[PDB]
Amino acid sequence: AEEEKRKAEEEKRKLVLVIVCVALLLDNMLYMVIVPIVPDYRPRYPTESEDVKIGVLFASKAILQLLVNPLSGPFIDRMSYDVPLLIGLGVMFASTVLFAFAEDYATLFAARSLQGLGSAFADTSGIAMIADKYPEEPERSRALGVALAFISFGSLVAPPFGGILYEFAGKRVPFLVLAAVSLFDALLLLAVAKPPVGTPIHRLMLDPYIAVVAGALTTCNIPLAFLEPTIATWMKHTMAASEWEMGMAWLPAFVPHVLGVYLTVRLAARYPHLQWLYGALGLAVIGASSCIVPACRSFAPLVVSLCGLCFGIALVDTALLPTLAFLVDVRHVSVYGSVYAIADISYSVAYALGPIVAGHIVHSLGFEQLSLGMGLANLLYAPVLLLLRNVGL
Ligand SMILES: O=C(c1ccc(Br)nc1)N1CC2(CCN(C/C=C/c3ccc(Cl)cc3)CC2)c2cc(F)ccc21
């Protein structure tokens, strides 16, 4: 009667993990489908008409979650994770039907800002629930790996099919049925789940290990903040490939991501205290790919540079997300809202700055200077990550 209840608890953990991963897949599906659609009002290149009045609408999501997350930390610390996860999925459903319902400028602005309001609860609550229900060390990294695999699926293989299903039927019908799948997911989490003073955000940042992880997340995420709104209009200047071979450059860069997650999980189960060197080895190929992209004149080298660039983010963001939970475990009290709020500030400070200044600094100086500067930053972020020789003690 003890093993029976234990198997029931294992089933109750797995049926919540799968539902959280499907919700994250659908969320990144939304974030990657709606990007070519906004400047309109067979595949589609991401960005067009990059100016000051539309890039601020593309960065409205990131600037609103950057403004919300320092207050949305303690709401997850005091309360549970089920309640902010349901609030995030509810306002994400409202935003998803709002994209289908309207076609103005300010209404699309409100629909893009409600996605930031939805992310700033749902994403941090999902990663906090995954880090809560797996207290032991290898299962934490394994659940992190499965979550990153579903997020990389829903953010990499989703645009070249979302565009070609957007061209045929129109806007309204696919976003209505996808919002129906989102409400079905939220109702199924309701039917399954049935719903410590903590430490403030004012002193988490002064902890230097939290600070170096927070710097590493921004520095590893910002090349995909500056290369996504730029490379599509740059392909037509050097080689000028066809439109199928311009928006599908990030599609073969998914299998090296999941193989990189598989590699660092399987060889972090062996060595427990080498995650800092996995992070440095991830930043190595991040900097190498961000240096080697403009040299790739043909299309297949420019695909293999992007698959190296997607390999590196897999290594870094699988090596440093369980490290952050272990760090807030063995150095502070065991709460998981504020430190992943710090992580989301570190993600969003790149995405709130990329699509505003990227096209203007390409038009002012050039694309190769941007690439060499970011590769210079990722290669010079080596002595800063030598501070993590003490987390195994
Ligand atoms: O395309 C985007 C994107 C999405 C939204 C917006 Br707005 N802009 C861009 N991304 C983001 C990113 C997504 C995955 N990582 C962050 C995940 C943190 C996280 C959150 C919850 C959980 Cl449970 C576990 C982990 C790193 C970055 C990524 C990796 C790739 F290999 C390729 C592309 C992308």
Side-chain angles (χ1 to χ4, degrees):
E2 184 178 1
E3 187 179 1
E4 182 175 0
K5 191 262 185 295
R6 184 182 64 85
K7 290 185 287 185
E9 178 64 31
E10 185 179 2
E11 180 180 0
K12 191 61 68 178
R13 186 178 64 244
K14 291 189 289 184
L15 293 177
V16 172
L17 178 63
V18 171
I19 285 175
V20 170
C21 292
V22 170
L24 293 173
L25 186 149
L26 294 176
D27 204 3
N28 290 112
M29 170 70 75
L30 265 298
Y31 298 129
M32 289 298 107
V33 164
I34 64 166
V35 175
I37 298 171
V38 175
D40 195 4
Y41 290 158
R42 273 74 169 174
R44 293 185 65 86
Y45 57 91
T47 58
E48 183 65 27
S49 296
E50 182 69 28
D51 201 359
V52 71
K53 65 182 180 181
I54 306 169
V56 64
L57 191 145
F58 283 107
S60 178
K61 184 260 179 183
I63 195 168
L64 192 141
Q65 66 178 357
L66 183 65
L67 186 59
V68 165
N69 281 317
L71 191 62
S72 178
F75 179 75
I76 303 171
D77 284 331
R78 272 84 54 84
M79 294 295 171
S80 296
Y81 309 103
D82 291 328
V83 176
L85 188 59
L86 264 298
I87 290 170
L89 291 178
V91 298
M92 190 63 66
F93 168 71
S95 179
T96 305
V97 296
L98 191 64
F99 277 102
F101 183 72
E103 67 271 14
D104 287 331
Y105 179 77
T107 64
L108 268 291
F109 180 75
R112 181 66 172 170
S113 296
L114 291 180
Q115 284 184 353
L117 182 63
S119 179
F121 290 102
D123 200 3
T124 174
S125 297
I127 187 60
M129 186 181 292
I130 292 171
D132 192 9
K133 288 185 184 293
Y134 292 96
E136 63 270 15
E137 183 67 28
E139 293 291 328
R140 188 188 297 273
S141 294
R142 185 172 293 114
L144 259 290
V146 176
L148 283 170
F150 278 100
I151 291 171
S152 68
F153 185 83
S155 177
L156 290 175
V157 307
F161 293 101
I164 66 170
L165 273 72
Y166 172 74
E167 290 290 328
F168 182 74
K171 180 180 286 192
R172 185 68 60 88
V173 179
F175 283 96
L176 285 177
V177 297
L178 193 57
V181 176
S182 179
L183 73 91
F184 185 79
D185 198 4
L187 288 176
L188 189 61
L189 200 154
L190 286 173
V192 171
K194 294 180 182 180
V197 297
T199 55
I201 309 171
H202 190 275
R203 295 292 182 185
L204 260 290
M205 191 66 203
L206 189 61
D207 194 5
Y209 299 97
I210 305 294
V212 68
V213 174
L217 293 176
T218 297
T219 309
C220 75
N221 199 8
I222 207 166
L224 264 64
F226 279 98
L227 290 177
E228 290 181 353
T230 305
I231 193 167
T233 189
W234 183 66
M235 289 298 290
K236 297 298 292 294
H237 188 273
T238 301
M239 185 57 74
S242 179
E243 292 179 352
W244 290 274
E245 296 176 353
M246 182 175 69
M248 293 174 70
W250 295 93
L251 181 61
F254 169 66
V255 180
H257 188 278
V258 67
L259 290 177
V261 172
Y262 185 82
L263 177 64
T264 185
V265 167
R266 184 174 291 275
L267 290 178
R270 181 180 174 90
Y271 294 96
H273 59 87
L274 201 139
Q275 292 178 356
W276 59 270
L277 194 143
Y278 291 118
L281 186 62
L283 293 176
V285 296
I286 288 297
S289 64
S290 294
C291 183
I292 207 63
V293 162
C296 297
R297 295 182 184 272
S298 179
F299 178 67
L302 196 142
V303 171
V304 75
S305 65
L306 292 173
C307 81
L309 179 59
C310 292
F311 182 79
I313 292 174
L315 287 181
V316 173
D317 290 333
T318 314
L320 291 175
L321 290 177
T323 303
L324 193 61
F326 179 77
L327 184 61
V328 73
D329 194 0
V330 301
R331 190 171 173 85
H332 293 285
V333 76
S334 178
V335 294
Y336 296 100
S338 297
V339 70
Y340 289 103
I342 293 297
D344 280 332
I345 295 298
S346 299
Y347 288 118
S348 301
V349 71
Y351 292 159
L353 192 145
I356 299 170
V357 79
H360 185 73
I361 65 175
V362 171
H363 185 272
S364 69
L365 296 176
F367 178 72
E368 63 182 2
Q369 187 62 256
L370 190 154
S371 67
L372 289 176
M374 189 56 222
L376 185 145
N378 289 315
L379 267 70
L380 289 178
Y381 201 70
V384 182
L385 202 66
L386 292 174
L387 297 173
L388 295 175
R389 293 176 293 171
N390 298 117
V391 297
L393 278 75

